[PDB]
Design an enzyme around this catalytic site. Sequence first.
Site, PDB file in Angstrom:
ATOM      1  N   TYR A 162      17.584 -74.849   7.640  1.00  0.00           N
ATOM      2  CA  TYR A 162      18.925 -74.883   7.026  1.00  0.00           C
ATOM      3  C   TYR A 162      18.852 -75.122   5.499  1.00  0.00           C
ATOM      4  CZ  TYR A 162      21.172 -73.951  11.471  1.00  0.00           C
ATOM      5  OH  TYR A 162      21.595 -73.344  12.626  1.00  0.00           O
ATOM      6  N   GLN A 187      33.298 -65.314  11.318  1.00  0.00           N
ATOM      7  CA  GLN A 187      32.101 -65.783  12.050  1.00  0.00           C
ATOM      8  C   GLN A 187      31.041 -66.405  11.101  1.00  0.00           C
ATOM      9  OE1 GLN A 187      29.831 -61.765  13.539  1.00  0.00           O
ATOM     10  NE2 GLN A 187      29.227 -63.683  14.579  1.00  0.00           N
ATOM     11  N   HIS A 218      32.568 -70.748  13.006  1.00  0.00           N
ATOM     12  CA  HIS A 218      31.214 -71.184  13.330  1.00  0.00           C
ATOM     13  C   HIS A 218      30.726 -72.332  12.445  1.00  0.00           C
ATOM     14  CE1 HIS A 218      30.304 -67.226  15.633  1.00  0.00           C
ATOM     15  NE2 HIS A 218      30.799 -68.158  16.428  1.00  0.00           N
ATOM     16  N   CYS A 278      28.604 -91.240  13.767  1.00  0.00           N
ATOM     17  CA  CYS A 278      30.038 -91.531  13.661  1.00  0.00           C
ATOM     18  C   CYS A 278      30.896 -90.280  13.692  1.00  0.00           C
ATOM     19  CB  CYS A 278      30.349 -92.344  12.403  1.00  0.00           C
ATOM     20  SG  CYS A 278      30.249 -91.397  10.866  1.00  0.00           S
TER      21      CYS A 278
HETATM   22 ZN   LIG Z   1      28.021 -91.649  10.151  1.00  0.00          ZN
END
Ligand SMILES: [Zn+2]
Lengths: 8, 262
Positions: free
Chosen positions: B64, B102, B120, B131
């Site tokens: 990523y 998308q 997406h 959290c």
């Molecule tokens: Zn957090």
Amino acid sequence: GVLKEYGV
Amino acid sequence: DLTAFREHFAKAKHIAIITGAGVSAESGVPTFRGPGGFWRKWQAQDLATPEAFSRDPSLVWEFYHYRREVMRSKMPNPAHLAIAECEARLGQQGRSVVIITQNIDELHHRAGSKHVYEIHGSLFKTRCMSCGEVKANHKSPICPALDGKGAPDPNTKEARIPVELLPRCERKSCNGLLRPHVVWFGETLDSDILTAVERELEKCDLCLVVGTSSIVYPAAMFAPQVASRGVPVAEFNMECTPATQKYHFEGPCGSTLPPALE
Ligand SMILES: [Zn+2]
């Protein structure tokens, strides 16, 4: 919920 | 027939534009699916899952990070821009344009589009695994441990970054491991987003499907609903149709779309 690709 | 399409366009009060990977491939942006769509040894399918993240979060973050970093040099194309400027121009006239994409590259945002549903997720948002907080993040590099990592050549050695040093939640009492706020293979689309999309599709009176197809997913979800209201649907994509074939403009959408939407 909708799987993306339909989970394909 | 461009003239027949433009007759509908002139009258349309609410346009829904669905975009797929074709509009992002034309900005020079790899998908990683199909031919040459490798990053090191892997393809998108192998990495964009919670099982990859659970078992090798450093590897998935390298992937990523690479993609985030590559986006700096990729730019919105004439199709993205036509879509954004169309929205601006029509909005001034009280006419509504919404983009249902998308794509996770945020190129629609960079182009100027405001009314965007990223079904997406986004490469430039994080979600905390602890959290649940979602936060926009364009930081280069996202954390120091990732700096200069993510090289795409298959013989690159793995960074093997300890989980503590991957991107963390900054509400200091939490400190949870962040993940990309992207829908992965095997995960459900957001229900709230889908309900908003259904409302827009149900109100729209013209729908465009750009850089994907009405018959593949995700377009196949939406477009039947609009077609069954009797609403014209117009595809802009490179894919051919037979000659024994509601509108289809074959070719790169960065060529076709600025002419159609002018
Ligand atoms: Zn957090």
